[PDB]
Design a protein around this ligand. Structure first.
Ligand code: 3OU
Length: 263
């Protein structure tokens, strides 16, 4: 529990699923981001109980939770500040002129954080470039993991809702709501594809409905021009029709390191 007397609010960073997020300082020293939870957007009591377990998730590639303010409304969520913002926008800026080794390192940063969460049997459920952030050193961290469970908006949580992450979801999630470690694995393959495509929308010429049908037929995302054969084999392995034939994050990380050494 953070005392809100120790927070300042300096600039607006944008808006997400739970409303406005601000940059400010904690204890007159530490840069932070502060989610100000919009009334009616979150299942608040459930989140508060879960924030306890989340406080114990700690990894260099996960955005660090610093604390919450819950003796008031709106409630605040205080985290590590990531100066370069969301990975999606960052990939879309041509000025960065990324080398492919940089791209693979962003895939490795995310894979490390996911290997950690898999070790704790904790699902993200909304892994995508829009939900990863980039710090001042160009390190990618996984953000907002687990928070999908507390979203009250049915457009986001329903398989058929307009805001559901359809293009990041395996067939068994779309068809049967079968969520598992292997549905995060499938989303991670789509994230690798986003990175090597410099932020293109997955299935850029299809609707959500057409995407669902394309992947039910066994068809998949094409190899981005920047991806070697070996990089494409890694993201492709995440998309096996049988969830139990997809790798773990531990295996993917070994595969990524092998390609780094090779290429
Ligand atoms: C349920 N799920 C999956 C959720 C729920 C809430 C949210 C998200 C998913 C993801 C999006 N989101 C959200 C909304 C608003 C802010 C943040 C958000 C933005 C940050 N940082 C920055 C830094 C700079 C800039 C910036 O404006 N630029 C412009 C020039 O180019 C360089 C950077 C933007 N954000 C940050 O550090 N955190 C921790 C969170 C976040 C991330 O947290 C949410 O709050």
């Amino acid at each position: 529990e953070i005392d809100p007397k120790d927070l300042t609010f300096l600039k607006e960073l944008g808006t997400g699923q739970f409303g406005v997020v601000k940059y400010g300082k904690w204890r007159g020293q530490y840069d932070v981001a502060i989610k100000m939870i919009k009334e009616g957007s979150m299942s608040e009591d459930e989140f508060i109980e879960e924030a306890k377990v989340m406080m114990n998730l700690s990894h260099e590639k996960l955005v660090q939770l610093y604390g919450v303010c819950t003796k008031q409304r709106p409630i605040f969520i205080i985290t590590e500040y990531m100066a370069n913002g969301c990975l999606l926008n960052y990939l879309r800026e041509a000025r960065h002129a990324f080398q492919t080794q940089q791209l693979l390192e962003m895939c490795k940063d995310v894979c490390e954080a996911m290997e950690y969460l898999e070790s704790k049997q904790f699902l993200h459920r909304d892994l995508a470039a829009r939900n990863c952030l980039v710090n001042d050193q160009g390190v990618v961290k996984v953000s907002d993991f687990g928070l999908s469970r507390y979203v009250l908006d049915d457009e986001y949580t329903s398989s058929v809702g307009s805001k559901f992450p359809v293009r990041w979801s395996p067939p068994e999630v779309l068809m049967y709501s079968k969520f598992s470690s292997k549905s995060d694995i499938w989303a991670f393959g789509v994230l690798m594809w986003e990175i090597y495509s410099l932020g293109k929308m997955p299935y850029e010429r299809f609707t959500n409905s057409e995407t669902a049908e394309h992947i039910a037929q066994g068809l998949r995302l094409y190899r981005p021009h920047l991806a070697s054969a070996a990089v494409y084999t890694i993201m492709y392995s995440c998309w096996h029709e049988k969830a139990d034939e997809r790798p773990t994050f531990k295996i993917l990380l070994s595969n990524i390191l092998d390609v780094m050494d090779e290429e």
